[PDB]
Amino acid sequence: RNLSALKRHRQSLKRRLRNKAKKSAIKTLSKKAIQLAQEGKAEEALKIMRKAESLIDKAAKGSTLHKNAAARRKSRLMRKVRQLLEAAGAPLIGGGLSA
Amino acid sequence: KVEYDLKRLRNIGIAAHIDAGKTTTTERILYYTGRIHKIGTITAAVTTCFWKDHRINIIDTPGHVDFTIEVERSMRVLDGAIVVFDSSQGVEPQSETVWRQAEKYKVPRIAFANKMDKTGADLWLVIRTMQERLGARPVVMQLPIGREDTFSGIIDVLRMKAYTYGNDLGTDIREIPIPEEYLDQAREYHEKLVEVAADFDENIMLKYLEGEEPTEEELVAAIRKGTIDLKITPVFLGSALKNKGVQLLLDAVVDYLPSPLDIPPIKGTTPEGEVVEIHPDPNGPLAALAFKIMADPYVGRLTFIRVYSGTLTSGSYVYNTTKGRKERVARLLRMHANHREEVEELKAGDLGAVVGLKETITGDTLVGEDAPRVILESIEVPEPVIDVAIEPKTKADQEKLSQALARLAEEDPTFRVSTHPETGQTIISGMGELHLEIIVDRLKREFKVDANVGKPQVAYRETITKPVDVEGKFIRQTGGRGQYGHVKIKVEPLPRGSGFEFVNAIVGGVIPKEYIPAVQKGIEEAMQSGPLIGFPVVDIKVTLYDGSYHEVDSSEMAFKIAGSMAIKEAVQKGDPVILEPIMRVEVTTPEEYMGDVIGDLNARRGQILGMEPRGNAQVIRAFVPLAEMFGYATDLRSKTQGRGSFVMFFDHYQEVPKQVQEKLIK
Amino acid sequence: GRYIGPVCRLCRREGVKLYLKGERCYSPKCAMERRPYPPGQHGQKRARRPSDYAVRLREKQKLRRIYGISERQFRNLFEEASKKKGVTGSVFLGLLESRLDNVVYRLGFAVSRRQARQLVRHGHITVNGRRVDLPSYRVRPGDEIAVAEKSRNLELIRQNLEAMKGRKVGPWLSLDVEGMKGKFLRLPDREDLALPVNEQLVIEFYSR
RNA sequence: UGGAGAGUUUGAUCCUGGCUCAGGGUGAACGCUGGCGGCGUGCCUAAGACAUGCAAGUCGUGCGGGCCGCGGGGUUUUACUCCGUGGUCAGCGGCGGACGGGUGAGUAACGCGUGGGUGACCUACCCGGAAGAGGGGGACAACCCGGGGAAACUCGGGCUAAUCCCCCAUGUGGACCCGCCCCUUGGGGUGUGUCCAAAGGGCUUUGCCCGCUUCCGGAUGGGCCCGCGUCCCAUCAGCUAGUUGGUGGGGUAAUGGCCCACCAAGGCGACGACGGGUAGCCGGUCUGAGAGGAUGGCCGGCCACAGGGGCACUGAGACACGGGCCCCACUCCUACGGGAGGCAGCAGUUAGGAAUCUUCCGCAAUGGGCGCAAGCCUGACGGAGCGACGCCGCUUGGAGGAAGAAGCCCUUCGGGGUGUAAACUCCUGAACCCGGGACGAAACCCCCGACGAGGGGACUGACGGUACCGGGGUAAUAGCGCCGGCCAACUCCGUGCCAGCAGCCGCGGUAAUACGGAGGGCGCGAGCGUUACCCGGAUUCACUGGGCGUAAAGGG
């Protein structure tokens, strides 16, 4: 009637549920950042962006994101942010983005 | 660990005329033989049950109802039988049949009076018949306490013990001694029993006259050694519905019912050609007969079989000589009254079902896969009695019907299909009304075919009364293939059953030698479509006494026409007469019913011919028209309540009563 | 299997005498010696001219009947000799000749091929040691065909091994009546085999 | 090293030309016969449905317990019942269930084949190299108690372990944006800034073994892209809006209208678009002198699909055949409130059909997953079974033996034939008997060594008491087709355009080598015929290798 491979499903669910979060996290967070950065919040933007970044390479560790999955998202985050901070702002605090 | 002494085998059949108690009696046997309860549907043909160190195989199905055939089939396979009787039905005219068809094969049986509780339930009354009707030597084996509504306990003479029944749920029984009165009644019947048993054991004979009582063990031996010979028939009793006399009838089983050994060996034939017994030794060649196929949803095709010699084995290989085929028996199976017992083998004399086999239909003989490729007997000959016209509506259904029998004729070879060799329409051979009737449901339902069901047609014939002579001319002279043929003939009627006779009555040769062949093929021909309705104008002599010709125009053919004209008209002219088919029939009937039997036949356009007695019966011969002869079964069986049977043959053709002349102009 | 049934009949038909029996065929009665004509009811009648086909068929039946060997096998061998590099005609004979049941007869251990076969079958023979029983076995160049030991003293073997003292054995074979041995020097040759058979025809027969 | 033609239009001829036959081949069926063995092979149809059993697991050397059998009992006695090891039951977590096995429905297409491109990528396990393994917290089952339920299970409290999760640290080093350097599609560097590592088990315990973390390289397997090749129908001629291109996003391991927004009107087609029919593709297979024609079963490679259809989750990998979700169809249980399923896995059932097998034995070998191992799983596989389905080998006898029995057939009645055939005579001795009896199996493990080389030792056979070997050993299965010509093989009797034959031409209408029987003969032989289908013959679609005045064919 049954085969103890559901042990694989039970897990299947757990894991999903886990990364499912750091997943949607980086999302909302990725936004909160570019938002300000564009809004003008020069430094306090770079702050969040620096956080977002972490949470990314952080998720890269497990099986959530991986390879360039992280690196890609980054090259776009600290890409658009910097391309909104030039909307007259001069990268204030020493956020991620390099001089 | 033998578990099979053979001498412990009881293969029995419950026969008896409808109403009775056959079926109900069986489910009951299948409750006692297996209520067990120890500190731990006739679901397929034959079933096994255990009763006091004895395996019993039952095949309840008889029914009698017109078509027996089946009853008489299980009968051949099995060894014993209970002829249940309806105690109530006293002025019982059909108690009969059943049995007179049992010794018909050669098998032993005991009697049971079932409804000993239903009004009119008079035990004696049966025996007052079981020797008055069939006339055997039954032996009172019990005497009921409380005739009918007052059905309490019962008494077994042979063992002078009394039992009782406090209910009808089959629980509160017990062996309580004789109740005050009664007693006396016993003795005498227990003496006659022993007096009867005397005609078997001399030991139980002297001891009788000396004043000693036969041992309860040597006494049984007599009765048993007496039944098995078809000399006596132990009668018992009890309301099978109220569970009474059953557990006692079950003893009655083993105690008097033959074992696969007490019975006479089956004959079979070698591939060379010579009879030979088949010995019940579970170590000789493997010889088994088949008798019932059934489609199981779980295991598929099932082929219930009765082994005689050798022993079939689970996961082996068999061989059916009948249809020269190598079947591979994979699994053996025994039907228990409630589950599927999967056993590993059936030793000679045992019965069950095999799984596998594809070409094995009814009556098949299966031997080892090297054994003498022999074929048993089985030859049963139950032909038909009632048929019908079946015209499959538009040619569409004419097919659904072909398949109809293409599977229905394997699932029941107790019939015959035939295409009337004279008029498309097909006949459906049956063995009694009901028979064809219920086919008409399945063949029309589970086959969705929707055709017609009226009656056959009659192979009429044309001919004449007065002799005539007319001209046969043809000539067509316009310019070339002249076409010139002409002849004169002498047409003259011949006795009803004369045939076809022509006469080469040409003098010098006014009609060339080479053209006569053709002038005949022309006359012979034309006679096809009658002058009245279009039927084989027969029973006449033709005389070609004249006709001329032309040197160039004549033709082999031109003459075939001219002669086909001379005839095409002599019959029209000599006053035609619509002849019809007359049959020879022989109704076997007790001169009891005879009186009306003959009547009815007279009022059937028929004229009687005689009645030279036979057995206790009497035979009647006579002629009749096939038209006024349809569905005769259910008319003969009417004027005889069942005790009537007939045959039928063709004879001659004869004029229709004129009133039936213009009738047929259809 | 190896035919069986009237033979000094085929001896006939082909009308070119054969030694299917061996000894007797030599006596005044190889059959054809007395009735040199096709069997059957007609047989002795003016024979219509043969068709271009009949001819080749008969030359095949001739050659194949000599070695008495199922058309099947006969054909396989031919179909081999063809694809074989060398004048197919000779070649074919080459193999036919290399059959153990034959080498035996040739070496004289048996009076007839029909007999030589039975011996081979019943292990009365041996090749370089291990005994063989397949008549069809094909001998290579430089083999020793000997009579087994259990055999050695069996009437038949003697008598036949007897008539051998004196007679010579094909240039492609060397026999030692004593040790009942015999080597397969070389592959027989076209002429060595004086057969009343033309290979050319037979070939042409397998070309249609 | 390879090429054969014939019959049939006429009174006769020559040409054209169609038809037809002899040859080979088959997952075959059907008919009549059928003795042995070896190696192959066996649902071609309903990709219809399917009872039953088994086809995927495994680690206690990752972790905490429940239950059971042992130690010593914790305390002074049972008490808060701990400990170490060996069974167990599930729960955790780790890998493996994406390989293996089945199938051809779909698909005319970068699906396949072949040859290449990845400055456009991925790769668990396995090798080699470099550097690490520093602190802390934290939940959820199991378990207990309580509640819903027919069932499948499920909900609520409360504990608790771990190689499970999470934060801080160090970052050999890797990831990102910016700038410069080499390079040249996103390839290597390099400086500022920023971001990220980790896990612990076993022993013989400062040393190993198995793991962990990051990074570079190898190896293996893959994704995507491109040139060329890849069937029939023009009585399918025009097709196209995410359509073709662009900019910017999203998405991905990665390119890309793969998706979206918004611009621009373009993209494709007689070199055959679009539409319709059919079909899984190849190595190969059959035939053929070759070119070519057919074809794609078994074995190997790729693809695709797992009742029909859609979809994501987990994960190195899947949109997963014995995983999940939803729709529909069908099967089953139901306390009818809701549950359980998917044999195109092995075997088998039913239906269909002309037709295609045992619910077999073994993990002994090979191979695969899990483990340090012992070992466990393994219908993959290694074998057995049934089937002349194919092919190969073998037997039913060998040597004698009559101017020649019998019977039967023909006859000119002299006789001819069957025919050395039988008989009979010797001789060998399939089958069958006692007896002996394998190869496949030498490693993993263990001991010396140094758990390396090398040396030594032990346990391992389903088939199988089979093959085979020695001894003993009886004359011991033949059919089927054909006999007018092509085409080898002819007489008699029946029959009378009847019955029947028949591939073609034709045979049969009182003497039939053509029907039916007999004798005899020819062919082949455990086979022999028939029916399907493909090549050949057919230079009869002609590239090799054809034609058009009148034969079919020149367009007004």
Ligand SMILES: CC(=O)O[C@H]1C[C@@]2(C)[C@@H](C[C@@H](O)[C@H]3[C@@]4(C)CC[C@@H](O)[C@@H](C)[C@@H]4CC[C@@]32C)/C1=C(\CCC=C(C)C)C(=O)O
């Ligand atoms: C179950 C048993 O034992 O008999 C049953 C089963 C039964 C013998 C049936 C009578 C008759 O159909 C029988 C035939 C031959 C009817 C024709 C086919 O369909 C056969 C395949 C079928 C086999 C058994 C069957 C179906 C029975 C009856 C029927 C009684 C009918 C009436 C109207 C009284 C019986 O026994 O009375």
Ligand SMILES: Nc1nc2c(ncn2[C@@H]2O[C@H](COP(=O)(O)OP(=O)(O)O)[C@@H](O)[C@H]2O)c(=O)[nH]1
């Ligand atoms: N009252 C009563 N009825 C009975 C008894 N035995 C049988 N019957 C009835 O007989 C009728 C037919 O029974 P069945 O055995 O099927 O008849 P069969 O098949 O012809 O033997 C039913 O009404 C049964 O109830 C009995 O002992 N008592």
Ligand SMILES: [Mg+2]
């Ligand atoms: Mg009944």
Ligand SMILES: [Zn+2]
């Ligand atoms: Zn001769």
